[PDB]
Design an enzyme around this catalytic site. Structure first.
Site, PDB file in Angstrom:
ATOM      1  N   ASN A 186       0.758  -1.256  -0.167  1.00 10.97           N
ATOM      2  CA  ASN A 186       0.188  -0.016  -0.036  1.00 10.97           C
ATOM      3  C   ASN A 186       0.823   1.360   0.174  1.00 10.97           C
ATOM      4  O   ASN A 186       0.280   2.299   0.194  1.00 10.97           O
ATOM      5  CB  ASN A 186      -1.113  -0.101   1.178  1.00 10.97           C
ATOM      6  CG  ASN A 186      -1.909  -1.340   1.351  1.00 10.97           C
ATOM      7  OD1 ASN A 186      -1.677  -1.717   2.544  1.00 10.97           O
ATOM      8  ND2 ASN A 186      -2.393  -1.682   0.467  1.00 10.97           N
ATOM      9  N   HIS A 188       2.909   2.070   2.273  1.00  6.40           N
ATOM     10  CA  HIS A 188       3.177   2.715   3.597  1.00  6.40           C
ATOM     11  C   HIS A 188       4.519   1.975   4.034  1.00  6.40           C
ATOM     12  O   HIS A 188       4.804   0.849   3.719  1.00  6.40           O
ATOM     13  CB  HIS A 188       2.060   2.170   4.457  1.00  6.40           C
ATOM     14  CG  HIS A 188       0.814   3.016   4.238  1.00  6.40           C
ATOM     15  ND1 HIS A 188       0.518   4.214   5.046  1.00  6.40           N
ATOM     16  CD2 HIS A 188      -0.155   2.997   3.082  1.00  6.40           C
ATOM     17  CE1 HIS A 188      -0.809   4.844   4.658  1.00  6.40           C
ATOM     18  NE2 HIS A 188      -0.926   3.937   3.536  1.00  6.40           N
ATOM     19  N   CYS A 223       5.732   7.329   9.624  1.00  5.41           N
ATOM     20  CA  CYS A 223       6.749   8.035   9.003  1.00  5.41           C
ATOM     21  C   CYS A 223       6.297   7.844   7.516  1.00  5.41           C
ATOM     22  O   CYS A 223       5.885   6.749   6.890  1.00  5.41           O
ATOM     23  CB  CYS A 223       8.256   7.334   9.089  1.00  5.41           C
ATOM     24  SG  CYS A 223       9.566   7.744   7.793  1.00  5.41           S
TER      25      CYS A 223
END
Ligand SMILES: CC(=O)Nc1cnccc1C
Ligand SMILES: CC(=O)Nc1cnccc1C
EC number: 3.1.2.14
Lengths: 265, 264
Positions: A186, A188, A223
């Site tokens: 995704n 991330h 992050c």
């Protein structure tokens, strides 16, 4: 891998790879954490999840990790077979919990154990919310009804409160940035990358003479792909204990806090 | 995994993991490169190496990668089983070559192929060496005697000369540093990390709309654990790119390469 006879837990075997081991020729804690995540994903797929339920996908809701706690007694050597058993449990409206037990496939002995706390969050607004009854009933049929705990003890390390590291830090590793291999499907940052970043501020002499026994990590904020992180460590202690803090390089915004326990080789 | 019937090659199956895939839910080229390296290590173990022979250990000699060339037709999806076959061959005094063929386990179709060139080096002085007969005879009994090539075609991309990128670069990613997960068991930067660093200077829009078809990478010098790298890319064209990895300070070259990308 496969669900157990009662269908309330999942087991899978892994052969430790050449690139998965450190200087000691045994699996790193990041390899262990990746395998826990992989067995977790296979358990979710085996019972029909994405781990979003039908209601969750309608309301744009996701499970996110709030805390990860891992204790390793023996790291499996290169070429060894490790068996991992995983299961989930509801923790009321607070969220869910996923637990793991790691075993040596040849001896059958417990060589590690892990526990993680997950919270419900809206994918878009990032707003945390309690678990509703409609969602809770969709996943309770896949959990043991009686409590099953990887860390059962009365005052275990898995539920301890972690304080915020105060400046100045004893050690630091500055300007850490994720690359494409650190991102999941995704886009991330993978939860395991944060474990690596925490460990980056531990001096090489501690890693060369000690073995990591316990790691507890709190996840406060994520992050982003274009963010930069600073990793901070201060000794708090035969055993060596450290207090850890990951924060964004610019504004100093906290992303994670944690503790590690190391034992002399 | 296991050696084949004739004992001159090695096969192994891998199930593609959740953390091994990119945004297309298929294995990244770094996952592919890690699996090639893993099947290579298992082949060496199965025939008694480690890939240092008996006289190499005595002379403090090691095999080091000079070049890696990979071509992927289909990246295996998450949960798919990929079968990889690997073998080695002598290239006279120049060094050795390791080749790979990747197949879909269900269909049996070739979904990728790779080839790599390895040179002899003294592990302490880092001085390149010609192989010599004593070492040559210790491993030729594990290689096919007739030539077996993953890239047989005359004038193939695997043997092309790569030029040095000239400043200014079109794109760049600076200040890249290895962390402990990027190091192997000997505390050296893993060869696959350099592939990742090269790819870091490709713009995200190319990655989002194209698939990587071919990557050729030359290894000139090692990046140490405390070194910092700059990744440089210039379009040369399908989309083709010229790449250069160099140390952040002095600008010392560590790698050069080329990539070919096809529109999705
Ligand atoms: C919410 C939760 O824990 N879901 C889950 C995912 N995979 C397997 C079993 C379960 C119960
Ligand atoms: C030098 C070389 O190519 N060695 C090798 C390693 N593993 C398996 C087979 C062979 C011939």
């Amino acid at each position: 891998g496969s669900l157990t006879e009662d269908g309330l837990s999942y087991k899978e075997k892994f052969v430790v790879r050449s690139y998965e081991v450190g200087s000691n020729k045994t699996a790193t804690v990041e390899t262990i954490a990746n395998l826990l995540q992989e067995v977790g994903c296979n358990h979710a797929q085996s019972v029909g999840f994405s781990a979003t339920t039908t209601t969750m996908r309608k309301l744009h809701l996701i499970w996110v990790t709030a805390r990860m706690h891992i204790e390793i007694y023996k790291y499996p050597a290169w070429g060894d077979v490790v068996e991992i058993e995983t299961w989930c449990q509801s923790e009321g409206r607070i969220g869910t919990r996923r637990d793991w037990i790691l075993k040596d496939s040849v001896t059958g002995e417990v060589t590690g154990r892990a526990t993680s706390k997950w919270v419900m969050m809206n994918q878009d607004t990032r707003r945390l919310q309690k678990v509703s009854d409609d969602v809770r009933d969709e996943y309770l049929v896949f959990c043991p009804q009686e409590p099953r705990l990887a860390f059962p003890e009365e005052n275990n390390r898995s539920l301890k409160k972690i304080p915020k590291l105060e400046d100045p830090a004893q050690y630091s590793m500055i300007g850490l940035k994720p690359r494409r291999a650190d991102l999941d499907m995704n886009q991330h940052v993978n939860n395991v990358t944060y474990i690596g970043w925490v460990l980056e501020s531990i001096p090489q002499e501690i890693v060369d003479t000690h073995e990591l026994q316990v790691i507890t990590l709190d996840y406060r904020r994520e992050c982003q792909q274009d963010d930069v992180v600073d990793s901070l460590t201060t000794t708090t202690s035969n055993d060596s204990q450290f207090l850890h803090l990951l924060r964004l390089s610019g504004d100093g915004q906290e992303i994670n806090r944690g503790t590690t326990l190391w034992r002399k080789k």
